[PDB]
Amino acid sequence: MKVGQDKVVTIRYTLQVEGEVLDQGELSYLHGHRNLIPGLEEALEGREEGEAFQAHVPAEKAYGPHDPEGVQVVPLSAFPEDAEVVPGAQFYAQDMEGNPMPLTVVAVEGEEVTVDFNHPLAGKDLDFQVEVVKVREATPEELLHGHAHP
Amino acid sequence: TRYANAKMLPF
Amino acid sequence: RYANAKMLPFAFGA
Ligand SMILES: [Cl-]
């Protein structure tokens, strides 16, 4: 069974940016519904179960470019009082539609805390070693929901 | 970009 | 803007 539309695909992957490997894992995802970065998805389309390969995905095709307008500053008022505001910590805020917008705090300067709304991998190209371990037809319920059930 | 008068929430 | 932000494998927000 080959990777294709409406098939739940389980793969294990190693990620390298520039030359540094930054993560390794196993994931299953539903193919064809925008659940996986496009460049990866395009590499996987058609692969037969068992195939193993290397894939290079430019930033535009994975997480996009870094947007300068995505880095902003808000008072420490906004952060919770129990909370630790330290470089690296991650929080969410609320958009006008009401939906959460996540951020990673970049710097704290007294009253002013600067945060970054970009994806952490924005602007960085990615290198992958990938193993396709299983492709299965999707379940009706996965199809109504839009996601593989983990 | 876009921000609201609502406080952030922990990880 | 960041329409890719939630896509796998490394997904920003959940
Ligand atoms: Cl999925």
Automatic annotation (TrEMBL), chain A:
Mg(2+) 1 binds at S77. The lineage of its organism: Bacteria, Thermotogati, Deinococcota, Deinococci, Thermales. It catalyses: [protein]-peptidylproline (omega=180) = [protein]-peptidylproline (omega=0). Ca(2+) 3 binds at E49. It comes from the Bacteria. Ca(2+) 1 binds at Q16. It is an enzyme of class 5 (isomerase). Gene3D superfamilies: 3.10.50.40. Zn(2+) 3 binds at E137. It comes from Thermus thermophilus (strain ATCC 27634 / DSM 579 / HB8). Pfam families: FKBP_C (PF00254). It is found in: Cytoplasm. Ca(2+) 2 binds at H33, N35. This is Peptidyl-prolyl cis-trans isomerase. Keywords: Calcium, Chaperone, Cytoplasm, Isomerase, Metal-binding, Rotamase, Zinc. Its EC number is 5.2.1.8. Zn(2+) 1 binds at N35. Zn(2+) 2 binds at E49. Also involved in hydrogenase metallocenter assembly, probably by participating in the nickel insertion step. This function in hydrogenase biosynthesis requires chaperone activity and the presence of the metal-binding domain, but not PPIase activity. One of its GO terms (biological process) is protein refolding. Ca(2+) 4 binds at A52. GO terms for molecular function: metal ion binding; peptidyl-prolyl cis-trans isomerase activity.
